[PDB]
């Protein structure tokens, strides 16, 4: 065994090894390994992406105008965000400026995706780590009604409703076909909700599974379908016609009325179901405000998103702020430049790829994707792995760093950056949330805090949907209908050689696409995605990424049952297809 120090942690691989493969209730394929000491405390953590497809290779030689459609299929969960980054990148390279309505509609597409993905994760992916579903069968329906009514104005709270939900669950398990609930962790000592809170949460799980399908009707209006809507280089294909012949063939007043109806319903569900449930999880699980901190009190990163001034990606335009913090110094939010070769770099010394020199990092305009499956001296063999060897190559995920630092990205990262830059709405929301819990601001830097920030952001994005809708309607009232710029659509109008960067904040964090065009074709296309950051393997200095750091020093009640590991990994909402592409 070996021991070394990094980032205030002691990384020690002596002692008992535990393996979790597959990780479930995520997107895609992940393996996790840890070592635990005699006191059942994690002393080593290993994050492994167990899939790869090679989109960066497939994109070579394609027409730049088609790229969005290929890279949208990086992920069907965060569907649309890669298309957005792609049209941004190609427009940056060629020198295309889109009309204001196209920019507004793109911002509506992104805010819709934030609302949808944050809601589904809370209930369908993370929820069963916190809610003991079988314990809901022991609840009193009247006491469940009283609890729900004390927390929210949401209409659906009668004792008869909670009795009906409880009886549906009782019938489901009566024949011994427990389905998704079979062989779960029910009764583990870390489940702390009372039976009435478990029944309330289970009812809301079912309400959210139904309601999420409605949110994406906004994507169907502007983008044709969800999953995987359509886009164009130059704007959007959804031409507008309000008051002329043939409005039946375009985005007209009846289509915009459908969008408005969905926005109001989405805000209502998030504010009156998701927000009170997140606060209730906090009230009953306060010790988790001190577990899973990881890199969140050290190094955090946001690129920023939602440009309000069309074609302006600067600080005065982005509604979601960008910036970086390192060394735990939240008094110094630093600006990010995605062209600077000394800022974003990716390492592969601990990943399954070839570089000419694996002891240095490469900026994405110098990126290389040359796959090399080489797990080395594993326990087991190369096609039958019992333990990865984390001293050598152990993942399909590359290792991104910012100025050589390992960073956390996502809702908690963005919330810290906006708070410390002085964004008034963020400061007010965070202060009120932490005051309700009687917890210090430092309590947000934790597994519990990641969940709270995600719920905050769903509320923020639902508000921004209305703001963007009203901006669109103001333009239409003023006779400004344009949705596409086509003066640089044809390849003969492009520079013979050019390069560009497209960036945004996906639901899970900072996203960038780097593209080089030569002679009308894609010459290079490199992606660095939020789960690539968070799920990163180690670098040549031995520095650990966000998942490995958040798992360090965690106590386990029952080593064979990985509930504490699942709670902390699920709090980042892992997307493994995104991470590897």
């Amino acid at each position: 065994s070996t021991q070394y120090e990094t980032q205030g942690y002691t990384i020690n691989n002596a002692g008992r090894r535990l393996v979790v493969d597959p990780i479930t209730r995520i997107e895609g394929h992940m393996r996790c390994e840890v070592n635990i000491n005699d006191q059942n405390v994690i002393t080593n953590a290993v994050s492994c992406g167990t899939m790869f497809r090679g989109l960066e290779i497939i994109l070579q030689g394609r027409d730049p105008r088609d790229a969005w459609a290929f890279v949208e299929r990086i992920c069907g969960v965060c569907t649309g965000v890669h298309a957005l980054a792609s049209v941004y990148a190609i427009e940056d390279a060629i020198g295309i400026k889109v009309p204001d309505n196209a920019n507004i509609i793109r911002n509506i597409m992104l805010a819709t995706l934030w609302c949808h993905n944050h809601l589904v994760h809370f209930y369908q992916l993370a929820g069963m780590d916190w809610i003991d579903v079988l314990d809901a069968l022991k609840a009193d329906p009247r006491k469940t009604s009283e609890l729900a009514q004390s927390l929210s104005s949401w209409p659906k709270s009668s004792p008869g409703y909670f009795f009906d939900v409880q009886n549906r669950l009782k019938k489901f398990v009566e024949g011994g076909q427990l389905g998704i609930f079979r062989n779960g962790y029910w009764g583990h000592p870390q489940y702390k909700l009372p039976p009435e809170a478990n029944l309330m949460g289970f009812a809301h799980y079912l309400e959210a599974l139904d309601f999420q399908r409605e949110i994406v009707k906004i994507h169907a209006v502007f983008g044709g379908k969800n999953p995987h809507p359509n886009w164009i280089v130059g704007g959007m294909p959804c031409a507008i016609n309000i008051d002329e012949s043939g409005a039946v063939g375009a985005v007209n007043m009846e289509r915009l009325n459908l969008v408005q109806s969905i926005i109001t319903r989405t805000a209502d569900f998030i504010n009156n179901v998701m927000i009170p449930d997140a606060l209730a999880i906090g009230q009953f699980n306060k010790p988790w405000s001190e577990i899973g901190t990881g890199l969140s009190d050290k190094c955090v990163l946001s690129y920023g998103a939602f440009p309000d001034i069309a074609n302006d990606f600067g600080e005065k335009s982005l509604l979601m702020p960008g910036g970086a913090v390192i060394n735990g110094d939240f008094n110094n939010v630093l600006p990010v430049d995605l062209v600077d070769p000394q800022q974003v770099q990716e390492f592969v010394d601990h990943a399954w790829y070839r570089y000419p020199n694996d002891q240095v990092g490469r900026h994405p305009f110098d990126g290389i994707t040359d796959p090399w499956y080489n797990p080395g001296d594993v326990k087991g063999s190369d096609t039958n792995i019992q333990q990865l060897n984390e001293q050598e190559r152990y993942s399909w995920i590359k290792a991104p760093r910012w100025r050589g630092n390992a960073m956390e990205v996502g809702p908690l990262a963005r919330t810290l950056i906006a708070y410390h830059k002085g964004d008034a709405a963020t400061v007010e929301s965070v202060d009120r949330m932490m005051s309700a819990l009687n917890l210090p601001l430092s309590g947000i830097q934790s597994t519990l805090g990641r969940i709270l920030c995600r719920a905050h952001e769903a509320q923020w994005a639902a508000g921004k949907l209305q703001y963007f809708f009203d901006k669109l309607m103001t333009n239409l009232k003023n006779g400004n209908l344009a949705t596409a710029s086509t003066e640089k659509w044809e390849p003969a109008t492009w520079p013979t050689e050019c390069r560009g960067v497209g960036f945004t904040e996906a639901p899970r964090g900072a996203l960038g696409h780097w593209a080089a065009i030569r002679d009308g074709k894609i010459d290079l296309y490199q992606c660095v995605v939020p789960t690539t950051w968070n799920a990163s393997p180690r670098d040549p200095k031995g520095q650990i990424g966000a998942y490995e750091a958040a798992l360090m020093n965690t106590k386990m009640a029952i080593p064979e049952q990985p509930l504490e590991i699942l709670r902390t990994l699920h709090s980042f909402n892992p997307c493994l297809a995104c991470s590897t592409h």
Partner: protein, 264 residues
């Protein structure tokens, strides 16, 4: 009465077919799971992970051997000894073969499981391969699209439960009910195609009147699916209705048939 056992596995994929399923409007996915089938294994939704998830997989395929339906999303890579997609430390293809051996029938959801989809587009770095080139001794129903339509997925499931049989298929294994006709044979812009009324550049006067998208690269004339009739997301829209030509996403090899903006 007991519900039919279903095992849902995932190879190389983007997860769009799973997301499509949960969008179903009638029946709701909630009601499919609670009342119509027994969804006995699925990495996206299940409580158990790791060794507990492996025990569920083993228990279900043993107890219900010969009696479960296998749903497959994504595909196996043949490159690097299969280690481009790893499940419980071994190649995914070993899990696919074990699950297929006990199944009564297999549903290949999406273009990935049916044909290959984006990871199989040139130069196919991982040697991604569709399910019917690996599993050659079981009935396979192909339900293509990237992803297939939500209410098509749930209608196929309700047909099979209600009628207690597989849907009748074309020569490629696709259900006749939803894949028997072309997009262009049920497209509401066909009047414009017939009259030579075409969009020539984005957001031109033709685009603002809903003219045909053939000259913008629409692949509807060669694509079999239900998008122009059943439509998407509770009947709200489809690609052409919102102004973009069909990409051809339900057809084998659609990524490598030239630019999406070059004519059919």
């Amino acid at each position: 009465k007991p519900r039919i056992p279903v095992v849902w596995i995932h190879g190389l994929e983007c997860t769009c077919c799973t997301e499509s399923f949960i969008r179903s409007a009638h029946p709701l996915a909630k009601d499919v799971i609670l009342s119509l089938i027994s969804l006995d294994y699925d990495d996206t939704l299940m409580a158990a992970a790791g060794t507990q998830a492996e025990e569920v997989f083993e228990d279900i395929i043993t107890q219900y051997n010969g009696k479960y339906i296998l749903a497959v999303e994504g595909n196996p890579p043949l490159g690097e000894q299969g280690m481009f997609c790893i499940s419980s430390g071994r190649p995914f293809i070993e899990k696919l073969k074990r699950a297929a051996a006990g199944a009564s029938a297999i549903i290949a959801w999406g273009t990935c499981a049916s044909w290959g989809c984006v990871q199989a587009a040139r130069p196919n770095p991982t040697q991604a391969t569709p399910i019917d080139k690996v599993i050659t001794d079981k009935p396979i129903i192909k339900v293509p699209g990237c992803p297939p339509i939500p209410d098509v997925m749930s209608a196929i499931i309700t047909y099979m439960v209600t009628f207690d049989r597989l849907p009748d298929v074309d020569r490629m294994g696709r259900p006749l009910m939803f894949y028997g006709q072309r997009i262009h044979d049920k497209c509401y812009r066909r009047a414009h195609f017939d009259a030579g009324e075409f969009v020539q550049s984005w957001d031109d006067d033709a685009a603002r009147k809903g003219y045909c998208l053939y000259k913008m690269g629409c692949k509807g004339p060669t694509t079999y699916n239900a998008c122009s009739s059943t439509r998407w997301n509770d009947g709200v829209s489809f690609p052409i209705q919102s102004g973009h030509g069909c990409l051809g996403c339900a057809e084998n090899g659609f990524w490598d048939r030239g630019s999406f903006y070059s004519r059919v």
